[PDB]
Design a protein around this ligand. Structure first.
Ligand SMILES: [Mg+2]
Ligand SMILES: [Mg+2]
Ligand SMILES: [Mg+2]
Ligand SMILES: [Mg+2]
Ligand SMILES: [Mg+2]
Ligand SMILES: [Mg+2]
Ligand SMILES: [Mg+2]
Ligand SMILES: [Mg+2]
Ligand SMILES: [Mg+2]
Ligand SMILES: [Mg+2]
Ligand SMILES: [Mg+2]
Ligand SMILES: [Mg+2]
Ligand SMILES: [Mg+2]
Ligand SMILES: [Mg+2]
Ligand SMILES: [Mg+2]
Ligand SMILES: [Mg+2]
Ligand SMILES: [Mg+2]
Ligand SMILES: [Mg+2]
Ligand SMILES: [Mg+2]
Ligand SMILES: [Mg+2]
Ligand SMILES: [Mg+2]
Ligand SMILES: [Mg+2]
Ligand SMILES: [Mg+2]
Ligand SMILES: [Mg+2]
Ligand SMILES: [Mg+2]
Lengths: 52, 99, 203, 148, 193
RNA sequence: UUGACCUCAAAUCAGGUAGGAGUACCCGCUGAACUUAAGCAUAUCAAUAAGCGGAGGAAAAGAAACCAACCGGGAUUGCCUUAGUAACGGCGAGUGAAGCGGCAAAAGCUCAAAUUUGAAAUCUGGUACCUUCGGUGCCCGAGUUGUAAUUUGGAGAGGG
RNA sequence: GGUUCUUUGUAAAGUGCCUUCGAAGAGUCGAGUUGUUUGGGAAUGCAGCUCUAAGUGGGUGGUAAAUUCCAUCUAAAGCU
């Protein structure tokens, strides 16, 4: 049971990857390559009203 | 008593307005009371002397203070208790010899 | 009161008055059973300051235990091992003769709980003890909250677990640097110091 | 991870990289620090000289908190001021208004003199100072204030 | 076996250490339990603020005496100077420590003043009244934070009196080192002739 | 002769209680050797396994005959750290804490030693009735070789 | 949240000043020796035997001892 299960990551490197992941959501080619059906979407990033 | 304000020396430490708190009661343990002095003095004449105390009384009269303290330190455990034992064997000898 | 005079008189153990009393009393205890009930404490001052109350539910027993070292109970003195464990004679039991006295009384009187015990006499062969016991089933003990704590199941056989005064002394239960091995129990301290503490995010 | 290890590459090979002659054994030279003076002596004298023997006097019950004295050099002395506040002190290197630096509150015991502070007077509150650190603070117009 | 140029390790694993391996798998489980325990105690003692007011004390030793932290409890002289008894203070969420003593006026003044805001910020419900609701505040430490004192000012005049603080340190320790020798010398110089 | 007292007995006396099981964890006793030291005896393994006694839902510890040496902290326990350090050790192999600091949780107290002495004011049991985890009255008993009130060192008591 | 028992009180408790006091644990502390144990090293704890206390005293202050101080607690009884 004392095998290492959880892995420590530097907080700034966790944040580094999160910022990269957010910026990758704005690239429609990456979103299309990831398997999403955004072929007929108006624009990326897709922003909707706060009423949602 | 007062600190010098510097980090080394005789009275090193920060200068602070002192307060001298009230003395506690626990800091009074051992202090003799009127009742307890009466009981310990009464028991001494009821019970009498120990065999080693009789020896110390004889050695004080015969061999002197130094030999009595050496035997008292052997019978007790310390040089400090040997002094207090020889001191109040001197008191018993002083009271017995007088009058 | 008279209990203060009894306390100061009991301290001068080598006076003529107590040399006679201890000589007569040590004879009486040899001629009685090794464990026997005492009708009253021969040291009522010492019993009081250990928590004895002169009321129904408090029992005094008297007990004598063989003095000396604990000879290793190996056949013919032969130990099977290294020379460091070949000692047989000069080996000492880790509990006081007072503690052995408390358990033997406690086993004889398993319906009671041992509160405390005190030395009364000794000769070359035995040390003599008087053990204060409290009845947890007696109604005079079950009410009167100053002593009904001992009616709890957690206090069954305190003398066997070393929870009495001599039991805690022999366990080493005292504060400070002199008792670092034994403050909360040395086996718990040893377990804690010999435990590998591994966190999910390894330090 | 296991899939990148040489154990995976040693599958199919008899000795798993340990040799047919050497024939990987339990503890061929002893366990741990065995034979540091006998059969591992050369390795000890080459790479750990000073290992065996005794050195100076013992210290029963050492409390490292007695010896706490973090040192701070003069080139880092001006880092104890926050940087936005720092510039208006570097300008107007004047007495009658000089920055007071409590090196103790920043966690330092002794101020050392690596040197070349600017020519701005500075009030230094220090538990200890080196002689040369005192010379350079006074040369800049400042003074060292002894505290405890 | 001793090997090539590596540091000497001291891995203490020559006992049955695998019988005493504690892996804190329950770290997430224990954190939820403490939060549930804190929520359970808060509802039980509502509107009391889950903890006692603690004094400000000077940390001991020379490494840490630059700091003030939260102490165990206010002294008997501190509670007295705040106009209340130790027995009553314990019942309104004040920690009272009988064994701590006051030898510092500024610590005592800070702790006495600390007691005065607390009495001015709490309301004690009547023992037999109607108990008006008081919108429970969970923390007493966060409501009365410990603040470090201001040792000096931002900037002031340079006052150089030619003391040479290093020389002051050298003379201070020299005076202590040779005091016992200089006291025998003074003793014998008066005794002789 | 009779009535106590003290000590010790007896009863299929009235009412109780103990044993044994479990024993992961806990409190103690007792206690190895394999093993390591490239041999081996001190050492190590290990104040461990086995053996034995005793509890609970936790246990133990616990409100300082503490830590300190500071501008002093302040019951116990546990975590991070101190620290593989101070220290111990054929000073070999190896072994090895504690203070401070930051957290979790926090909670404090009780007797003995005091003449109630113008009131043993204390308590068990039996019996009767009840509002029956108990209460009330009555009686026997315990208890002055000390049961209650009052005080526990942080104090506190008498008197004013 | 409410509803009786409201002589459920000079009964309990706390608070100021002065004065006299202030009882505080013994085959125990401590010491020697022996054995064991500890990181504890002129001896960390425990235990056996021998000695065996004082009361401005006692313990501790991690090098034995003597002399002079200083600091810090209040053991040898107990609950949580
Ligand atoms: Mg061996
Ligand atoms: Mg983790
Ligand atoms: Mg090949
Ligand atoms: Mg093959
Ligand atoms: Mg092969
Ligand atoms: Mg050779
Ligand atoms: Mg019957
Ligand atoms: Mg245990
Ligand atoms: Mg071998
Ligand atoms: Mg071998
Ligand atoms: Mg061992
Ligand atoms: Mg076992
Ligand atoms: Mg159970
Ligand atoms: Mg629990
Ligand atoms: Mg418990
Ligand atoms: Mg307990
Ligand atoms: Mg106390
Ligand atoms: Mg503490
Ligand atoms: Mg040793
Ligand atoms: Mg070991
Ligand atoms: Mg009262
Ligand atoms: Mg005491
Ligand atoms: Mg043993
Ligand atoms: Mg050993
Ligand atoms: Mg202090």
């Amino acid at each position: 049971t004392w095998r290492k299960w959880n892995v420590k990551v530097n907080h700034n490197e966790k944040r580094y990857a999160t910022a990269s992941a957010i910026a990758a959501t704005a690239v429609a080619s990456l979103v299309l390559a990831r398997g999403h059906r955004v072929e007929k979407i108006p624009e990326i990033p897709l922003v909707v009203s706060t009423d949602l | 008593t007062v600190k010098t304000g510097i980090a080394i020396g005789l009275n090193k430490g920060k200068k602070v307005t002192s307060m001298t708190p009230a003395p506690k009661i626990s800091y009074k343990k051992g202090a003799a009371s009127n009742r307890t002095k009466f009981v310990r003095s009464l028991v001494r004449e009821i019970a009498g002397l120990s065999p080693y105390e009789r020896r110390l009384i004889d050695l004080i009269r015969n061999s002197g203070e130094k030999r009595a303290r050496k035997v008292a330190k052997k019978r007790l455990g310390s040089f400090t208790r040997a002094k207090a034992k020889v001191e109040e064997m001197n008191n018993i000898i002083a009271a017995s010899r007088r009058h | 009161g008279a209990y203060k005079y009894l306390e100061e008189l009991q301290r001068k153990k080598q006076s003529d008055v107590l040399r006679f009393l201890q000589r007569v009393r040590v004879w009486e205890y040899r001629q009685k059973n090794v464990i026997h009930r005492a009708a009253r404490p021969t040291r009522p001052d010492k019993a009081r300051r250990l928590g004895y109350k002169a009321k129904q539910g408090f029992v005094i027993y008297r007990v004598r235990v063989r003095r000396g070292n604990r000879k290793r109970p190996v056949p013919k003195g032969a130990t099977y091992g290294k020379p460091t464990n070949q000692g047989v004679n000069e080996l000492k039991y880790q509990r006081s003769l007072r503690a052995t006295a408390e358990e033997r009384v406690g086993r004889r009187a398993a319906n009671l709980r041992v509160l405390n015990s005190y030395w009364v006499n000794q000769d070359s062969t035995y040390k003599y003890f008087e053990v204060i016991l409290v009845d947890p089933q007696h109604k005079a003990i079950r009410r009167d909250a100053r002593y009904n704590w001992i009616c709890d199941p957690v206090h069954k056989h305190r003398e066997a677990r070393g929870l009495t005064a001599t039991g805690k002394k022999s366990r080493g239960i005292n504060k400070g640097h002199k008792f670092n091995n034994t403050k909360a129990g040395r086996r718990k301290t040893w377990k804690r110091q010999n435990t590998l503490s591994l966190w999910r995010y390894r330090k | 991870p296991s899939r990148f290890t040489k154990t995976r590459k040693h599958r199919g090979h008899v000795s798993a990289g340990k040799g047919r002659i050497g024939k990987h054994r339990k503890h061929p030279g002893g366990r741990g620090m065995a034979g540091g003076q006998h059969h591992h002596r050369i390795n000890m004298d080459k790479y750990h000289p000073g290992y065996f023997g005794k050195v100076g006097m013992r210290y029963f019950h050492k409390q490292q908190a007695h010896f706490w004295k973090p040192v701070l050099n003069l080139d880092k002395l001006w880092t104890l001021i926050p940087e936005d506040k720092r510039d208006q002190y570097l300008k107007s290197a004047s007495k009658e208004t000089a920055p007071v630096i409590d090196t103790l509150a920043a966690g330092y015991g002794k101020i050392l003199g690596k040197g070349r502070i600017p020519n701005v007077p500075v009030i230094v509150k220090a538990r200890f100072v080196s002689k040369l650190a005192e010379e350079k603070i006074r040369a800049a117009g400042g003074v060292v204030e002894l505290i405890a | 076996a001793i090997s090539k140029n590596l540091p000497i390790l001291k891995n203490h694993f020559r006992k049955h250490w695998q019988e005493r391996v504690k892996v804190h798998f329950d770290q997430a489980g224990k954190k939820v339990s403490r939060r549930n325990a804190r929520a359970t105690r808060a509802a039980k003692i509502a509107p009391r603020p889950l903890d006692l007011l603690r004094p400000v004390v000077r940390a001991p030793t020379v490494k840490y005496n630059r700091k003030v932290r939260a102490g165990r409890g206010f002294t008997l002289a501190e509670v007295k100077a705040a106009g209340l008894t130790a027995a009553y203070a314990r019942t309104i969420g004040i920690a009272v420590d009988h064994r701590r003593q006051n030898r510092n006026q500024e610590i005592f003044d800070a702790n006495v003043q600390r007691l005065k805001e607390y009495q001015s910020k709490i309301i004690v419900f009547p023992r037999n009244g109607k108990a008006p609701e008081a919108e429970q505040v969970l923390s007493a430490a966060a409501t009365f934070p410990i603040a470090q004192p201001a040792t000096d000012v931002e900037a002031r005049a340079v006052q150089d009196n030619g003391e040479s603080a290093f020389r002051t340190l050298r003379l201070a320790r020299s005076e202590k080192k040779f005091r016992g020798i200089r006291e025998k010398r003074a003793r014998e110089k008066a005794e002789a002739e």
